[PDB]
């Protein structure tokens, strides 16, 4: 048939309304046509959000798709919970159990708390913006008490447009004083770009600084500016550009025109636009599972106003909610599955990391297991481990008293063990104490002409250095290289 | 909303009433658009808002003044989300500038049957740094429930 | 532009600009950070003519 829906978009949702209309094309199957409405508004204005909600409610809609800010979030969930009109959003996930609101920005609280534990932080800063509740700040402050953190949260949300430069600059001078090398940027794409412009200008993207960007939009802001210098900026991302549905999308995304679909001639989609594209997938399949059970809905076309007093519900509204929350489609952001409340369950967040070649996935976080560290398990290109050979001789190498419960270079003690530690910190290497095999010092056989002992492991490649009581002789100097004598006798 | 619009039908010239954290935005936008004066004994809005007259003065200044008087550097700050988060943002910003060690904990998501259960787990975690300085940021009902 | 991008305008670096044109290029970009860039100038903007 045809399902009427609604639309609440900010003035400036260019790529989000573009990725909306793309999914209108690609997810039609012509048995039903989800004909939409458009009500471009200010999300941070509870008058306009109320006004546009009631108008659409008046004009017979079955699901309203929109964005909310933290100045309208309680206006949305109250109207959508009283009048049962289901609400699909990619905006920030609400703090609570607000029904009839189906939310697609999954959660980044558990992923952010897992990543700080991974790098073993105890002192950091938490530059945050108000911008979407304080639910992520409250999550890290509650975890600060029990996990021995020292958060130093400052409130980068109210900086005015003119005096931006002196305010950001005086801020990091304060972080300079208490030596905050580790910073977490809980802002959105616009204010993350404004902050990383300021850490470049005063020179704090050099080696020593770390920057987790608490955002599911890591490769959606300019990272090329901070890619060189030495900062170790990490982050999170839901849109993996190495998978089937996304790689098909970026092909047809790049071919579009920036005159009817604005901001749609690149190879990077913002995560708000991707979840907007994932929303029309869910809204299609939910009314398709409402076609599959032979269900028709809502003979109204009548309801004159939202403010009814007595507010009368409509019983099909529960059923539309039931359809929307059992939608296990897959899309740009992964396994789209909702709980009984409208909060996304099993899903995957790719912990990216910015390196000199580019951004680089180093793990993934899912709700079920934990942060699972992926490949790069082997590729490190270590310096070297140096095989140093000695012999069991007192006081040169003696096995320590409790050598059964020890392992590595600390099973042994003696003169040459203390000497090998001194050679290692002047030449700058890491060593592996290795007692010789045969038990000799080294002698060339008269028949086989084969060196044994510690001389034979340096000639034949089985060792790299012999820090040992090894006598400087004539026949050994011809085959190996001695130092100046560390002990004359 | 439905009570505000019933007042606007009957044509009043001032609306006296209370708001919450979940209705501060509804009031200040409806009063700022339909130009209707609003006198309130509830918490003062964080931000320049027209047409809303706040009768509760302020507490962000006096609370930061009293901490410096007792010369605190390591307290704990039990707070409650209802009546806002402005006083939390004040003491966290002044902690950076004055080297405090605030241990802010939300105590407002507590249901009234795990009430004793979570509060014993609450003061357990306060003995993890052995906090002897608490700032109850709640209103009368939850203050008496913590006392 | 390249000493900013790889982060070498921080404190410790000095940069004499052998040019009689010191305040004729963009110096605002490197003014903060810690570099101690000096230079030369013939046009004094504090005199009569
Ligand atoms: O390079 C050599 N370094 C050696 C060092 C030592 C030690 F003193 F323990 F350091 C000894 N010992 C001396 C007394 O008997 C027990 C072991 C023998 C060594 N030998 C064999 P040698 O020189 O033919 O006698 C070498 O060849």
Author numbering:
A (entry chain B): 10 to 498
B (entry chain A): 59 to 205
C (entry chain D): 206 to 254
From the study:
To gain insight into the structural mechanism of PMP inhibition in the presence of γ5 and CNIH2, we supplemented the purified protein with 100 µM ZK and 100 µM PMP and subjected it to cryo-EM. Data processing revealed two populations of particles. Reconstruction from the second population of particles revealed densities for two γ5 and two CNIH2 subunits around the GluA2 TMD, molecules of ZK bound to LBD clamshells, PMP at the extracellular collar and SPD in the channel selectivity filter. The resulting GluA2–γ5–CNIH2ZK-SPD-PMP structure is similar to GluA2–γ5ZK-PMP, except that the latter lacks two CNIH2 subunits and SPD. Comparison of these structures suggested that binding of CNIH2 to GluA2–γ5 complex causes slight splaying of the LBD dimers, clockwise rotation of the ATD layer, movement of γ5 away from the channel core and counterclockwise displacement of the M4 segments. Nevertheless, all these changes are minor, and do not affect conformations of individual LBD clamshells, LBD dimers or the closed channel pore. GluA2–γ5–CNIH2ZK-SPD-PMP showed apparent asymmetry of the intracellular portion of the channel pore, which has not been observed in AMPAR structures before. Cysteines C589 formed two pairs of disulfide bridges clearly detected in cryo-EM density, illustrating the twofold symmetry of the channel intracellular entrance. Crosslinking of C589 cysteines was not observed in the GluA2–γ5ZK-PMP structure or in the absence of PMP (GluA2–γ5–CNIH2ZK-SPD), indicating that CNIH2 and PMP together are the two factors that cause strong deviation of the AMPAR inner pore from the fourfold rotational symmetry, likely due to increased protein flexibility in this region. CNIH2 likely reduces the potency of PMP inhibition by influencing AMPAR gating equilibrium, supported by conformational rearrangements in the LBD layer, movement of the transmembrane helices and altered flexibility of the selectivity filter that results in C589 crosslinking.
